[PDB]
Amino acid sequence: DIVFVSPQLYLSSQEGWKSDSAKSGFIPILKNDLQRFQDSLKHIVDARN
Amino acid sequence: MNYNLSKYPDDVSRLFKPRPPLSYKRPTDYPYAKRQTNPNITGVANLLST
């Protein structure tokens, strides 16, 4: 139903940026939007590459 | 008190201040679910009529 996402852990290339269970710092987002969410950050990653 | 949901204004309502909360004491009696009078009453026996 909902996925928990850590844009810090994602942009830092670390593994655990998402999980199904609730963890301290993650933001709940809609699961279908997860893919969409990745799009929103890609340019940031594109700036680092 | 803050809200005082009442007919009285603020000064009268703050005048009715209750005593502080009652301290907790562990129950010395039998819980309500366990409460019963004596069961297994021995009926009037043929040995009693004896």
Add this chain to the structure above:
Amino acid sequence: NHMSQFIYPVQQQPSLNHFTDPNNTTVFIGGLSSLVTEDELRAYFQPFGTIVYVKIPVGKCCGFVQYVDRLSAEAAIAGMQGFPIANSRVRLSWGRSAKQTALLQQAMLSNSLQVQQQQPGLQQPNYGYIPSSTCEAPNVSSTMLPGCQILNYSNGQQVIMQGSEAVVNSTNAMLNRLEQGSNGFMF
């Protein structure tokens, strides 16, 4: 129910001299050697903050300095007290600038009023400036985020400080000041 239990305190004003002026910046540095130049005194009072300098009198063996912010001034007064310059223990306190000094000295002969005029304020809000900070040298489009120092002063031009370039500039002038200082060009 006429009089009340509590009142706000009312209090008298202390005549507004240069010692009770909360906006005063310029620090009178007395007890100099008069063997010292002004560019050497700047070397002493530079790190405490950005300076808008006034003057060092000739033959009077006492100078004075002026900063932009009072925090830098107080940091200089507490920082250097009794610190010898050319083997003379320096005694420094608060004092006015050159023009107000003139307005005082014309009154000292005629002993009339000596009405002080306090320094101008900075019209304070300012969200971009962090007091007691220096721009060590001179295109900048920044993020204007809180941590960085946005605005600053130049040794009279307000400049936007680039946090990345400021450290490498300051270290560049630092390593130049050693090589020129050892051989006698800078003092």
Add this chain to the structure above:
Amino acid sequence: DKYTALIHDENFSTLTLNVSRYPKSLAYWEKLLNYIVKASAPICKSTEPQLLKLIRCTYSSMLNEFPYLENYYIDFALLEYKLGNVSMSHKIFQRGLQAFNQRSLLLWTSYLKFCNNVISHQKQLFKKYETAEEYVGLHFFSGEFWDLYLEQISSRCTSSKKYWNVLRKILEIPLHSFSKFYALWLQRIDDIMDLKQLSQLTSKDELLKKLKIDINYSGRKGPYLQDAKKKLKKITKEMYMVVQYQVLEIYSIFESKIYINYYTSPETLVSSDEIETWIKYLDYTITLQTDSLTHLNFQRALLPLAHYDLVWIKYSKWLINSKNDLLGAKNVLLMGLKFSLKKTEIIKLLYSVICKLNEYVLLRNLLEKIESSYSDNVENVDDFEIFWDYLQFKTFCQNSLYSSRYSDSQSNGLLNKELFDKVWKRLSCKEKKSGQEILLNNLVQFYSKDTVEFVEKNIFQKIIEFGWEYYLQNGMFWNCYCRLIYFDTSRSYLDKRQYIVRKIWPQIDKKFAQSVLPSLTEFCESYFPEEMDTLEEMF
């Protein structure tokens, strides 16, 4: 149902995706939260647990991103309290008080207010107030806190001893409202009808000694007690003199200048005068030498501006020198790494604190952490201070790890296969990266045979062969390549000056001369006045 009706709404997807795209805004967090609350508006126990789990995880995930928000720890506590579990309310009050290091006035006041209703066992309840007192008690606005605590004694306590005990302490504190408590003290002096009740103020001996009044006095008591109330009110008037003086100073100078006592957000800016008054207020507080009020006034000053690194550095300095506590300073700088945005000064001073503390595995670990932040390229960073502070402390470590390779026992600091490749990768970028000459100047510092040969061939020679224009037009390059040969202890004077003139100089192109001459003259003017002419004839 209401939950699924909230998911399929477009506003939840948009607000959510905004939050996850822009974490530190706190504007999108508060809209996401205010919206998901209003969708749930009958928030009582009836509403289904999925929605409560989402809204709860939303609070708890917001408070982690912004560890200073007092009204949100309070608000989430009240949500848990209306929902019917007080244990979760307690726990997350404890969480908020822990985020502030146990000193915040609002969380203690709004906490104990909650604690009066839900906690019996008078003793423990008062232990909460004694814990709050030794932390936030001396706060300048803490009087209303005391107003709670005194209010809780007079209702709970039959003895009245403790009310005199506490109110006597409140008399000596320079609060914002001292006079409110002086009126209670004076009134309670006025209501004393017997000599026996003067022992409540102070013991029997100090009254007979200092003020020379006797409780056991036997005779016509009335006028004697009226004299005793005057003699007791005089000294209270004196205490009022001192404490009034302190309060009026603290207000007239500092507290009157402070317009913002709260956190706002990471995107807030504070005015310069407010910064200056926090700095001077902290210096004054340090001067008072009251440790509780000192740490309080740092944490009090810390929430208005947490993101600068300004008060973090000072609050590490006063604790590293005045108190002489080095671990506490390390811990201050570590907690400062989280809130502060700039982080460079804090991490430099932090490198130093860790060096002096003699923890090398922690420092080297932290260097591994900061090089892992950039994906093992620190050399490509835009901001030079991070690469430089990283590179020199990294050097200080690999000097200790690997034994020196070079004669004369000189450690190889900046010349190593690991670090020299880092330096050379930093230099290959030329105009695009900032540091440049600063990194180059420190390659001249070796002062020996082996290392002047090494740095001669492996950089200053290769940089000529590849022939980059930025480094050749530069005068700092040629000046340093002269100073590298000139300070060698192996060479005599003749081969030194002859080597600089016959080789180093003619390698300069005459079109670069206009830029190269000013900096390279400064080397020749001071050190070689004799050969100054053959310099001028070349250009």
Add this chain to the structure above:
RNA sequence: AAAAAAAAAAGGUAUGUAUUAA
């Protein structure tokens, strides 16, 4: 021889509106 019609509102509390002085 017999005869024929009935007498009546009560009064309590609360809310809103108006009046009772230079």
Add this chain to the structure above:
RNA sequence: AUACUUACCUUAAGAUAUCAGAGGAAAGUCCUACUGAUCAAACAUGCGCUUCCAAUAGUAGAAGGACGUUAAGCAUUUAUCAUUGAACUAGUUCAUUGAAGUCAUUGAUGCAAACUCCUUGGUCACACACACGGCGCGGAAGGCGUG
């Protein structure tokens, strides 16, 4: 307080000590500031009736408390359940997922003392008086008795 408008609503029943005798309107009822007995209340009033009512010839003491301190006193006993994976004896540790979860562990239970402070009393009169266990004036609380 008066006038008008609107709303909310209306009578559980019976009785006022008992018993007995005489009278008035064979059975029953009602009645008699009628006669006796017993009971009850109020008011008086008494008892060699009973118990209690604090030091000043001294810095005390009696009753009752502290929702007071010593006091983190001393001595004890306690800190969640389920699922999956790894190691392990043939139960144990670590990590992950779910459920509820008064606070306290300076707690809670038991044991004991010291100290400090609060409320209360006739702090009355006569007496400092070698007896075989009274017969001063009052107040408080009772019991018994007469009117």
